[PDB]
Amino acid sequence: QQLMMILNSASDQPSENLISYFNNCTVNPKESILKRVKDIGYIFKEKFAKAVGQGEIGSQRYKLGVRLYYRVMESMLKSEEERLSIQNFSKLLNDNIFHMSLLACALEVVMATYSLSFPWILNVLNLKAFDFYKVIESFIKAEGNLTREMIKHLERCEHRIMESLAWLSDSPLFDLIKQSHTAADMYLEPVRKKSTSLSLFYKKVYRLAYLRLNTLCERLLSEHPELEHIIWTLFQHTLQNEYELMRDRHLDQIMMCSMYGICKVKNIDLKFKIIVTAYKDLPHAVQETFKRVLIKEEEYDYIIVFYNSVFMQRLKTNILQYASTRPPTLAPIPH
């Protein structure tokens, strides 16, 4: 409530100190930014009411998002003023996706505060999950007054993107994989040089996925504490080189298939039900991630089907190496 107070007692328009930043720009963004806000209010209020029904509360919801947005932007620009050139500073304040993403993050903070949850706001504004992800950490770092709970909600939005949404078909993420650390750096990347967006994203994916396997292996593989490290390499080599297997799927599905897979090739019998059972106890686990996965185009099925009919058909050649006289070398633990 400490933040919602300044938002409820603050102005509807950009501050004088923020107007300075606008005045220090080669191309001045003042008019592009506000018209952008005005236009977007309309798509937000329409799509809002068409979800709760009739009575218009959305206008008040949007106006607080707009106040948070202008506040967070000012805070963000104050550090980017030393980091960015005169020309990068202006390329940023004129970049639309950066702005959409920032405003979307403001709007989600209020929506979630007033518990249509994420990822509603992305589709409302037609914003790709991978673009929105680029703003979150710097958004947190730029709003000192976020509640513990608000921070925690945003980090959960970040993690849903990394686990599934950025892997949806049409995600620019795949463009970036084929082509081959702040929000402003990541939005200033030119469309077409090693990409900072993909590299940070992957450094964080690996750290997240591994935290989830490590919990899952301590409970179920106390008898094979050496197997944990062997499983991560299959998981990591999968994500790096066989990335297509995540298209429209969930990080946790590739995890579970790997730990079952290695224990099969090591002649360690542990059936899928014993792990799918252990997986549910994870904080935000949901049973459909293992109850319905993709087998064939526009087809859904149980998880063991995916393991037998999708996972091995690409990776059978790579897995048997794990038991030969020449087993593949183990992957570095993400720091």
Side-chain angles (χ1 to χ4, degrees):
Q1 192 56 51
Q2 175 77 15
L3 167 70
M4 302 315 217
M5 275 195 285
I6 181 48
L7 292 191
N8 283 281
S9 73
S11 167
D12 270 334
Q13 285 291 8
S15 148
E16 295 179 343
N17 215 342
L18 180 32
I19 294 169
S20 308
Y21 294 135
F22 301 150
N23 297 330
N24 294 334
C25 285
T26 320
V27 162
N28 183 262
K30 302 184 280 191
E31 267 210 319
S32 206
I33 294 161
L34 56 73
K35 299 196 237 75
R36 194 184 288 101
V37 155
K38 291 171 183 170
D39 305 337
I40 291 293
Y42 295 181
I43 307 175
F44 177 83
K45 299 163 183 202
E46 268 294 326
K47 290 206 173 182
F48 181 83
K50 290 205 213 71
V52 292
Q54 197 196 343
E56 185 274 322
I57 323 82
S59 169
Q60 183 67 0
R61 291 295 170 76
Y62 182 84
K63 266 44 172 63
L64 284 186
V66 168
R67 293 168 164 181
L68 188 52
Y69 160 87
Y70 281 149
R71 164 200 189 73
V72 170
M73 172 189 306
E74 202 193 78
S75 172
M76 195 170 304
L77 294 184
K78 204 173 292 270
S79 51
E80 294 290 348
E81 214 200 35
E82 337 184 10
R83 303 176 71 262
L84 296 181
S85 68
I86 287 189
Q87 150 175 321
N88 281 331
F89 197 83
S90 198
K91 191 186 168 198
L92 177 67
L93 288 174
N94 273 108
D95 189 318
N96 182 64
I97 294 175
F98 154 75
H99 276 279
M100 296 292 293
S101 296
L102 187 72
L103 176 56
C105 203
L107 294 178
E108 165 82 19
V109 162
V110 313
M111 303 267 85
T113 290
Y114 291 134
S115 55
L116 197 70
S117 60
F118 185 84
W120 180 75
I121 182 56
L122 297 181
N123 304 36
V124 165
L125 307 174
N126 185 42
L127 189 61
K128 290 289 190 193
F130 179 81
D131 285 309
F132 179 74
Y133 144 81
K134 299 171 182 165
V135 82
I136 297 176
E137 289 300 4
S138 317
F139 190 92
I140 300 170
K141 281 145 221 44
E143 188 42 82
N145 294 129
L146 292 172
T147 71
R148 173 162 58 195
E149 301 66 62
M150 205 0 92
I151 295 196
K152 183 178 179 180
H153 168 67
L154 289 182
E155 292 177 358
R156 195 180 153 182
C157 296
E158 188 175 344
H159 292 168
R160 289 186 62 181
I161 293 173
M162 297 166 181
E163 79 182 358
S164 70
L165 305 168
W167 305 93
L168 301 171
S169 300
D170 286 299
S171 178
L173 179 68
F174 291 107
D175 299 337
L176 294 200
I177 296 174
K178 189 177 184 312
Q179 278 203 108
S180 180
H181 58 324
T182 72
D185 301 340
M186 278 171 143
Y187 295 114
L188 279 165
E189 271 186 25
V191 187
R192 300 290 276 161
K193 352 166 83 273
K194 274 181 188 162
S195 185
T196 308
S197 282
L198 177 75
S199 60
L200 187 53
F201 184 83
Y202 250 106
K203 164 104 191 59
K204 296 197 154 244
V205 170
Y206 292 147
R207 184 67 180 147
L208 172 66
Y210 175 79
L211 290 172
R212 298 184 184 175
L213 171 57
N214 178 251
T215 79
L216 240 63
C217 277
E218 275 178 2
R219 203 166 270 171
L220 299 107
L221 283 178
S222 324
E223 293 156 277
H224 295 277
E226 81 287 353
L227 278 180
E228 195 214 344
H229 200 163
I230 303 169
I231 301 168
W232 169 241
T233 307
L234 185 52
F235 194 10
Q236 197 270 315
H237 288 359
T238 293
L239 301 170
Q240 187 181 274
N241 312 321
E242 313 281 0
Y243 57 85
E244 282 297 328
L245 288 185
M246 284 284 306
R247 188 178 296 263
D248 314 310
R249 284 174 250 223
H250 198 290
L251 182 74
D252 293 342
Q253 303 163 341
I254 309 302
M255 179 175 62
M256 289 179 280
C257 291
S258 311
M259 26 171 5
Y260 180 89
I262 292 305
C263 289
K264 296 293 184 185
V265 187
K266 290 290 192 188
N267 290 331
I268 303 318
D269 189 287
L270 76 92
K271 313 188 314 174
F272 250 110
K273 44 181 59 60
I274 178 90
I275 54 111
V276 303
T277 301
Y279 169 78
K280 41 180 178 213
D281 297 336
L282 283 224
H284 303 96
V286 301
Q287 33 255 99
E288 27 279 86
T289 90
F290 68 79
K291 267 170 37 204
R292 55 145 183 84
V293 212
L294 174 59
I295 306 296
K296 309 277 193 313
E297 59 187 350
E298 61 185 4
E299 169 179 345
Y300 300 85
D301 216 329
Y302 185 69
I303 190 178
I304 303 171
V305 195
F306 172 75
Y307 178 73
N308 282 328
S309 71
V310 180
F311 207 82
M312 309 277 281
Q313 289 308 330
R314 261 124 222 103
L315 308 175
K316 59 193 183 75
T317 56
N318 308 97
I319 303 182
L320 42 74
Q321 298 165 11
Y322 284 72
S324 76
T325 57
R326 180 174 163 174
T329 207
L330 294 172
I333 291 300
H335 301 300

Coordinates of all heavy atoms in Angstrom, one line a residue, residues 87-155:
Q87 N 22.8 9.5 -28.5 CA 22.1 8.9 -29.6 C 21.3 7.6 -29.2 O 20.2 7.4 -29.5 CB 23.1 8.6 -30.7 CG 22.8 7.5 -31.7 CD 23.9 7.6 -32.8 OE1 24.2 8.7 -33.3 NE2 24.4 6.4 -33.2
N88 N 22.0 6.8 -28.3 CA 21.2 5.7 -27.7 C 20.1 6.2 -26.7 O 19.1 5.6 -26.7 CB 22.2 4.7 -27.0 CG 22.9 3.8 -28.0 OD1 22.3 3.4 -29.0 ND2 24.1 3.3 -27.7
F89 N 20.4 7.2 -26.0 CA 19.4 7.8 -25.1 C 18.1 8.1 -25.9 O 17.0 7.9 -25.4 CB 19.9 9.0 -24.3 CG 19.1 9.4 -23.1 CD1 19.3 8.8 -21.9 CD2 18.1 10.4 -23.3 CE1 18.5 9.2 -20.8 CE2 17.4 10.8 -22.2 CZ 17.5 10.2 -20.9
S90 N 18.3 8.8 -27.1 CA 17.2 9.2 -27.9 C 16.6 8.0 -28.7 O 15.4 7.9 -28.8 CB 17.6 10.3 -28.8 OG 16.5 11.0 -29.3
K91 N 17.4 7.1 -29.2 CA 16.9 5.9 -29.8 C 16.0 5.1 -28.8 O 15.0 4.5 -29.2 CB 18.0 5.0 -30.3 CG 17.5 3.8 -31.3 CD 18.5 2.8 -31.8 CE 17.8 1.5 -32.4 NZ 18.6 0.2 -32.6
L92 N 16.3 5.2 -27.5 CA 15.5 4.4 -26.5 C 14.1 5.1 -26.3 O 13.1 4.5 -26.3 CB 16.2 4.2 -25.2 CG 15.4 3.5 -24.1 CD1 15.2 2.1 -24.5 CD2 16.1 3.5 -22.7
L93 N 14.2 6.4 -25.9 CA 12.9 7.1 -25.6 C 12.0 7.2 -26.8 O 10.9 7.7 -26.6 CB 13.2 8.5 -25.1 CG 13.8 8.6 -23.7 CD1 14.2 10.0 -23.4 CD2 12.8 8.0 -22.7
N94 N 12.5 6.8 -27.9 CA 11.6 6.8 -29.1 C 11.3 5.4 -29.5 O 10.4 5.2 -30.4 CB 12.3 7.5 -30.3 CG 12.1 9.0 -30.3 OD1 12.9 9.8 -30.0 ND2 10.8 9.4 -30.6
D95 N 11.8 4.4 -28.8 CA 11.5 3.0 -29.2 C 10.2 2.5 -28.6 O 10.0 2.7 -27.4 CB 12.6 2.0 -28.7 CG 12.4 0.6 -29.3 OD1 11.3 0.1 -29.3 OD2 13.4 0.0 -29.7
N96 N 9.3 2.0 -29.5 CA 8.0 1.7 -29.1 C 7.9 0.5 -28.2 O 7.2 0.4 -27.2 CB 7.1 1.5 -30.3 CG 5.7 1.2 -30.1 OD1 4.9 2.0 -29.5 ND2 5.3 0.0 -30.4
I97 N 8.7 -0.6 -28.6 CA 8.6 -1.8 -27.8 C 9.0 -1.6 -26.4 O 8.4 -2.2 -25.4 CB 9.3 -3.0 -28.5 CG1 8.7 -3.3 -29.9 CG2 9.4 -4.2 -27.7 CD1 9.5 -4.3 -30.7
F98 N 10.1 -0.9 -26.2 CA 10.5 -0.6 -24.9 C 9.4 0.1 -24.1 O 9.1 -0.4 -23.0 CB 11.7 0.3 -24.9 CG 11.9 1.2 -23.7 CD1 12.3 0.7 -22.5 CD2 11.6 2.5 -23.8 CE1 12.5 1.5 -21.4 CE2 11.7 3.4 -22.7 CZ 12.2 2.8 -21.5
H99 N 8.7 1.1 -24.7 CA 7.6 1.7 -24.0 C 6.4 0.8 -23.7 O 5.9 0.8 -22.6 CB 7.2 2.9 -24.8 CG 8.1 4.1 -24.6 ND1 7.9 5.0 -23.5 CD2 9.1 4.6 -25.2 CE1 8.7 5.9 -23.5 NE2 9.5 5.8 -24.6
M100 N 6.0 0.1 -24.7 CA 4.9 -0.8 -24.5 C 5.2 -1.7 -23.4 O 4.3 -2.0 -22.6 CB 4.6 -1.6 -25.8 CG 4.2 -0.8 -27.0 SD 2.5 -0.1 -26.7 CE 1.6 -1.7 -26.8
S101 N 6.4 -2.2 -23.3 CA 6.8 -3.2 -22.3 C 6.8 -2.6 -20.9 O 6.3 -3.2 -20.0 CB 8.2 -3.8 -22.7 OG 8.2 -4.4 -23.9
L102 N 7.3 -1.4 -20.8 CA 7.4 -0.7 -19.6 C 5.9 -0.4 -19.1 O 5.6 -0.6 -17.9 CB 8.2 0.6 -19.8 CG 8.4 1.5 -18.5 CD1 9.5 0.7 -17.7 CD2 8.9 2.9 -18.7
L103 N 5.1 0.2 -20.0 CA 3.7 0.5 -19.6 C 3.0 -0.8 -19.2 O 2.2 -0.8 -18.3 CB 3.0 1.2 -20.7 CG 1.5 1.5 -20.3 CD1 1.4 2.2 -19.0 CD2 0.9 2.3 -21.4
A104 N 3.2 -1.9 -20.0 CA 2.6 -3.2 -19.7 C 3.0 -3.7 -18.3 O 2.2 -4.4 -17.6 CB 2.9 -4.3 -20.7
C105 N 4.2 -3.4 -17.9 CA 4.7 -3.8 -16.6 C 4.1 -3.0 -15.4 O 3.7 -3.6 -14.4 CB 6.2 -3.7 -16.6 SG 7.0 -4.9 -15.3
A106 N 4.0 -1.7 -15.6 CA 3.2 -0.8 -14.8 C 1.8 -1.4 -14.7 O 1.3 -1.7 -13.6 CB 3.2 0.6 -15.4
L107 N 1.1 -1.5 -15.8 CA -0.3 -2.0 -15.7 C -0.4 -3.4 -15.0 O -1.3 -3.6 -14.3 CB -0.9 -2.1 -17.1 CG -1.0 -0.7 -17.8 CD1 -1.6 -1.0 -19.2 CD2 -1.8 0.2 -17.0
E108 N 0.5 -4.3 -15.2 CA 0.3 -5.6 -14.6 C 0.5 -5.5 -13.0 O -0.1 -6.2 -12.3 CB 1.3 -6.6 -15.1 CG 1.4 -7.9 -14.2 CD 0.4 -8.9 -14.4 OE1 -0.3 -8.9 -15.5 OE2 0.1 -9.7 -13.5
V109 N 1.4 -4.6 -12.6 CA 1.6 -4.4 -11.2 C 0.4 -3.9 -10.5 O 0.1 -4.4 -9.4 CB 2.8 -3.4 -10.9 CG1 2.7 -2.8 -9.5 CG2 4.1 -4.1 -11.2
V110 N -0.4 -3.1 -11.1 CA -1.7 -2.6 -10.5 C -2.7 -3.7 -10.6 O -3.4 -4.1 -9.6 CB -2.1 -1.3 -11.1 CG1 -0.9 -0.3 -11.1 CG2 -2.7 -1.5 -12.5
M111 N -2.9 -4.3 -11.8 CA -3.9 -5.4 -12.0 C -3.7 -6.4 -10.9 O -4.7 -6.9 -10.3 CB -3.7 -6.1 -13.3 CG -3.7 -5.3 -14.6 SD -5.3 -5.3 -15.3 CE -5.9 -3.9 -14.3
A112 N -2.5 -6.9 -10.7 CA -2.2 -8.0 -9.8 C -2.4 -7.5 -8.4 O -2.9 -8.3 -7.5 CB -0.8 -8.5 -10.0
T113 N -1.9 -6.3 -8.0 CA -2.3 -5.7 -6.8 C -3.8 -5.8 -6.5 O -4.2 -6.1 -5.3 CB -1.8 -4.3 -6.7 OG1 -0.3 -4.2 -6.7 CG2 -2.3 -3.5 -5.5
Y114 N -4.6 -5.5 -7.5 CA -6.1 -5.5 -7.3 C -6.7 -6.8 -7.7 O -7.6 -6.9 -8.6 CB -6.7 -4.3 -8.1 CG -6.4 -2.9 -7.6 CD1 -6.0 -1.9 -8.4 CD2 -6.5 -2.7 -6.2 CE1 -5.7 -0.7 -7.9 CE2 -6.2 -1.4 -5.7 CZ -5.8 -0.4 -6.5 OH -5.5 0.8 -6.0
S115 N -6.2 -7.9 -7.2 CA -6.8 -9.2 -7.5 C -8.3 -9.3 -7.3 O -8.8 -9.4 -6.1 CB -6.1 -10.3 -6.6 OG -6.2 -10.0 -5.3
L116 N -8.1 -12.9 -15.1 CA -7.6 -11.8 -15.9 C -6.2 -11.5 -15.5 O -5.6 -10.4 -15.8 CB -8.5 -10.5 -15.6 CG -8.3 -9.4 -16.6 CD1 -9.0 -9.8 -17.9 CD2 -8.9 -8.1 -16.0
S117 N -5.5 -12.5 -14.9 CA -4.2 -12.4 -14.5 C -3.2 -12.5 -15.7 O -3.6 -13.0 -16.8 CB -3.8 -13.4 -13.5 OG -3.9 -14.8 -14.0
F118 N -2.0 -12.0 -15.6 CA -0.9 -12.3 -16.5 C -1.1 -13.8 -17.0 O -1.4 -14.7 -16.2 CB 0.4 -12.1 -15.8 CG 1.6 -12.2 -16.6 CD1 2.1 -11.2 -17.4 CD2 2.3 -13.4 -16.6 CE1 3.2 -11.3 -18.2 CE2 3.4 -13.6 -17.4 CZ 3.9 -12.5 -18.2
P119 N -0.9 -14.0 -18.3 CA -0.5 -13.1 -19.3 C -1.6 -12.3 -20.1 O -1.4 -12.2 -21.3 CB 0.3 -14.0 -20.3 CG -0.5 -15.4 -20.2 CD -1.1 -15.4 -18.8
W120 N -2.6 -11.9 -19.3 CA -3.7 -11.1 -20.0 C -3.1 -9.8 -20.6 O -3.4 -9.5 -21.8 CB -4.8 -10.8 -19.0 CG -5.9 -10.0 -19.6 CD1 -6.9 -10.4 -20.5 CD2 -6.2 -8.6 -19.4 NE1 -7.7 -9.4 -20.9 CE2 -7.3 -8.3 -20.2 CE3 -5.6 -7.6 -18.7 CZ2 -7.8 -7.0 -20.3 CZ3 -6.1 -6.3 -18.8 CH2 -7.2 -6.0 -19.6
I121 N -2.3 -9.1 -19.8 CA -1.9 -7.7 -20.3 C -1.1 -7.8 -21.6 O -1.0 -6.8 -22.3 CB -1.2 -7.0 -19.2 CG1 -0.8 -5.6 -19.7 CG2 0.1 -7.8 -18.7 CD1 -2.0 -4.8 -20.1
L122 N -0.4 -8.9 -21.8 CA 0.4 -9.0 -23.0 C -0.5 -9.1 -24.3 O -0.4 -8.2 -25.2 CB 1.3 -10.3 -23.0 CG 2.4 -10.4 -21.9 CD1 3.2 -11.8 -22.1 CD2 3.4 -9.3 -21.9
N123 N -1.4 -10.0 -24.3 CA -2.4 -10.2 -25.4 C -3.2 -9.0 -25.5 O -3.6 -8.6 -26.6 CB -3.2 -11.5 -25.2 CG -2.3 -12.7 -25.0 OD1 -1.2 -12.7 -24.4 ND2 -2.7 -13.8 -25.6
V124 N -3.6 -8.3 -24.4 CA -4.3 -7.0 -24.5 C -3.6 -6.1 -25.5 O -4.2 -5.5 -26.4 CB -4.6 -6.4 -23.2 CG1 -5.0 -5.0 -23.3 CG2 -5.6 -7.2 -22.4
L125 N -2.3 -5.9 -25.2 CA -1.5 -5.0 -25.9 C -0.7 -5.6 -27.1 O 0.2 -5.0 -27.7 CB -0.5 -4.3 -25.0 CG -1.1 -3.6 -23.7 CD1 0.0 -3.1 -22.8 CD2 -2.0 -2.5 -24.1
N126 N -1.0 -6.8 -27.4 CA -0.3 -7.6 -28.4 C 1.2 -7.4 -28.2 O 1.9 -6.7 -29.0 CB -0.7 -7.2 -29.8 CG -0.1 -8.0 -30.9 OD1 0.1 -9.2 -30.7 ND2 0.3 -7.4 -32.0
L127 N 1.7 -7.9 -27.1 CA 3.2 -7.8 -26.7 C 3.7 -9.2 -26.6 O 3.1 -10.0 -25.9 CB 3.4 -7.0 -25.5 CG 4.8 -6.6 -25.1 CD1 5.5 -5.8 -26.1 CD2 4.8 -5.9 -23.7
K128 N 4.8 -9.5 -27.3 CA 5.4 -10.8 -27.2 C 6.1 -11.0 -25.9 O 6.8 -10.2 -25.4 CB 6.5 -10.9 -28.3 CG 6.0 -11.0 -29.7 CD 5.3 -12.3 -30.0 CE 5.0 -12.5 -31.5 NZ 4.0 -13.6 -31.8
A129 N 5.8 -12.2 -25.3 CA 6.4 -12.5 -24.0 C 7.9 -12.2 -23.9 O 8.4 -11.8 -22.9 CB 6.1 -14.0 -23.6
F130 N 8.6 -12.5 -25.0 CA 10.1 -12.4 -24.9 C 10.5 -10.9 -24.9 O 11.4 -10.5 -24.2 CB 10.7 -13.1 -26.1 CG 12.3 -13.0 -26.1 CD1 13.0 -13.8 -25.3 CD2 12.9 -12.0 -26.8 CE1 14.4 -13.7 -25.2 CE2 14.3 -11.9 -26.8 CZ 15.0 -12.7 -26.0
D131 N 9.7 -10.0 -25.5 CA 10.0 -8.6 -25.4 C 9.7 -8.0 -24.0 O 10.4 -7.2 -23.5 CB 9.2 -7.8 -26.4 CG 9.8 -8.0 -27.9 OD1 11.0 -7.8 -28.1 OD2 9.0 -8.3 -28.7
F132 N 8.6 -8.4 -23.4 CA 8.2 -8.0 -22.1 C 9.2 -8.4 -21.0 O 9.6 -7.6 -20.2 CB 6.8 -8.5 -21.7 CG 6.3 -8.1 -20.4 CD1 5.8 -6.8 -20.1 CD2 6.2 -9.1 -19.4 CE1 5.3 -6.5 -18.9 CE2 5.6 -8.8 -18.1 CZ 5.2 -7.5 -17.9
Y133 N 9.7 -9.6 -21.2 CA 10.8 -10.2 -20.3 C 12.0 -9.2 -20.1 O 12.6 -9.1 -19.1 CB 11.2 -11.5 -20.8 CG 12.7 -11.8 -20.6 CD1 13.2 -12.2 -19.3 CD2 13.6 -11.6 -21.6 CE1 14.5 -12.4 -19.1 CE2 15.0 -11.8 -21.4 CZ 15.4 -12.2 -20.1 OH 16.8 -12.4 -19.9
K134 N 12.3 -8.5 -21.2 CA 13.5 -7.7 -21.1 C 13.5 -6.6 -20.2 O 14.5 -6.1 -19.8 CB 13.8 -7.1 -22.5 CG 14.0 -8.2 -23.6 CD 14.1 -7.5 -25.0 CE 14.3 -8.5 -26.1 NZ 14.0 -7.7 -27.4
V135 N 12.2 -6.2 -19.7 CA 12.1 -5.0 -18.9 C 12.0 -5.3 -17.4 O 12.2 -4.4 -16.6 CB 10.9 -4.2 -19.3 CG1 9.6 -4.8 -18.7 CG2 11.1 -2.7 -19.0
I136 N 11.8 -6.5 -17.0 CA 11.3 -6.8 -15.7 C 12.3 -6.5 -14.6 O 12.0 -5.8 -13.7 CB 10.8 -8.3 -15.6 CG1 9.6 -8.6 -16.6 CG2 10.5 -8.6 -14.1 CD1 9.3 -10.1 -16.5
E137 N 13.5 -7.1 -14.8 CA 14.5 -6.9 -13.7 C 14.8 -5.4 -13.5 O 15.0 -4.9 -12.4 CB 15.8 -7.7 -14.0 CG 15.6 -9.3 -13.8 CD 15.2 -9.8 -12.4 OE1 15.0 -8.9 -11.5 OE2 15.2 -11.0 -12.1
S138 N 15.0 -4.7 -14.6 CA 15.3 -3.3 -14.5 C 14.1 -2.5 -13.9 O 14.3 -1.4 -13.4 CB 15.8 -2.7 -15.8 OG 16.7 -3.6 -16.4
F139 N 12.9 -3.1 -14.2 CA 11.7 -2.4 -13.7 C 11.7 -2.5 -12.2 O 11.5 -1.5 -11.5 CB 10.4 -3.1 -14.3 CG 9.1 -2.3 -14.0 CD1 8.7 -1.4 -14.9 CD2 8.4 -2.6 -12.8 CE1 7.5 -0.7 -14.6 CE2 7.2 -1.9 -12.6 CZ 6.8 -0.9 -13.4
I140 N 11.8 -3.7 -11.6 CA 12.0 -3.9 -10.2 C 13.1 -3.0 -9.7 O 12.9 -2.2 -8.7 CB 12.3 -5.4 -9.9 CG1 11.2 -6.3 -10.4 CG2 12.6 -5.6 -8.4 CD1 11.6 -7.9 -10.4
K141 N 14.3 -3.0 -10.3 CA 15.4 -2.3 -9.7 C 15.1 -0.8 -9.8 O 15.7 -0.1 -8.9 CB 16.7 -2.6 -10.5 CG 17.3 -4.0 -10.0 CD 18.0 -4.8 -11.1 CE 17.8 -6.3 -11.1 NZ 16.3 -6.7 -10.8
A142 N 14.2 -0.3 -10.6 CA 13.9 1.1 -10.7 C 12.7 1.5 -9.8 O 12.5 2.8 -9.6 CB 13.5 1.4 -12.2
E143 N 11.9 0.6 -9.3 CA 10.9 0.9 -8.3 C 11.2 0.4 -6.9 O 11.1 -0.8 -6.6 CB 9.5 0.3 -8.7 CG 8.4 0.8 -7.9 CD 8.4 2.3 -7.5 OE1 8.0 3.2 -8.3 OE2 9.1 2.6 -6.4
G144 N 11.8 1.3 -6.1 CA 12.2 0.9 -4.7 C 11.0 0.5 -3.8 O 11.3 -0.2 -2.9
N145 N 9.8 0.9 -4.1 CA 8.7 0.7 -3.2 C 7.9 -0.5 -3.6 O 6.7 -0.7 -3.1 CB 7.8 2.0 -3.3 CG 8.5 3.2 -2.7 OD1 8.5 4.3 -3.2 ND2 9.0 3.0 -1.5
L146 N 8.4 -1.4 -4.4 CA 7.6 -2.6 -4.7 C 7.5 -3.4 -3.4 O 8.5 -3.6 -2.7 CB 8.2 -3.4 -5.8 CG 8.2 -2.8 -7.2 CD1 9.0 -3.8 -8.1 CD2 6.8 -2.5 -7.8
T147 N 6.3 -3.9 -3.1 CA 6.2 -4.9 -2.0 C 7.0 -6.1 -2.3 O 7.3 -6.4 -3.4 CB 4.7 -5.2 -1.8 OG1 4.3 -6.1 -2.8 CG2 3.9 -4.0 -1.7
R148 N 7.3 -6.8 -1.2 CA 7.9 -8.2 -1.3 C 7.0 -9.0 -2.2 O 7.5 -9.7 -3.1 CB 8.0 -8.8 0.1 CG 8.5 -10.3 0.2 CD 9.0 -10.8 1.6 NE 8.2 -10.6 2.8 CZ 8.7 -10.7 4.1 NH1 10.0 -11.0 4.3 NH2 7.8 -10.5 5.1
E149 N 5.7 -8.9 -2.0 CA 4.7 -9.7 -2.8 C 4.7 -9.3 -4.2 O 4.5 -10.1 -5.1 CB 3.3 -9.5 -2.1 CG 3.2 -9.9 -0.7 CD 4.0 -9.0 0.3 OE1 3.7 -7.8 0.4 OE2 4.9 -9.5 1.0
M150 N 4.8 -7.9 -4.5 CA 4.8 -7.4 -5.8 C 6.0 -7.8 -6.6 O 5.9 -8.4 -7.7 CB 4.6 -5.9 -5.8 CG 4.0 -5.3 -7.0 SD 3.5 -6.6 -8.3 CE 1.8 -7.0 -7.7
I151 N 7.2 -7.6 -6.0 CA 8.4 -8.2 -6.6 C 8.2 -9.7 -6.9 O 8.5 -10.2 -7.9 CB 9.6 -8.0 -5.6 CG1 9.9 -6.5 -5.5 CG2 10.8 -8.8 -6.0 CD1 11.2 -6.1 -4.9
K152 N 7.7 -10.4 -5.9 CA 7.6 -11.9 -6.1 C 6.6 -12.2 -7.2 O 6.9 -13.2 -8.0 CB 7.2 -12.5 -4.7 CG 7.1 -14.1 -4.9 CD 6.8 -14.8 -3.6 CE 6.8 -16.4 -3.9 NZ 6.4 -17.2 -2.7
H153 N 5.6 -11.4 -7.4 CA 4.6 -11.7 -8.5 C 5.3 -11.5 -9.8 O 5.2 -12.3 -10.7 CB 3.4 -10.7 -8.4 CG 2.6 -10.8 -9.7 ND1 1.9 -11.9 -10.0 CD2 2.3 -9.8 -10.6 CE1 1.3 -11.7 -11.2 NE2 1.5 -10.4 -11.5
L154 N 6.0 -10.3 -10.0 CA 6.8 -10.0 -11.2 C 7.8 -11.1 -11.5 O 8.0 -11.5 -12.6 CB 7.4 -8.7 -11.1 CG 6.4 -7.5 -11.2 CD1 7.2 -6.2 -11.1 CD2 5.5 -7.5 -12.4
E155 N 8.6 -11.6 -10.5 CA 9.6 -12.6 -10.7 C 8.9 -13.9 -11.2 O 9.4 -14.7 -12.0 CB 10.4 -12.9 -9.5 CG 11.4 -11.8 -9.1 CD 12.2 -12.2 -7.9 OE1 11.9 -13.3 -7.3 OE2 13.0 -11.4 -7.4

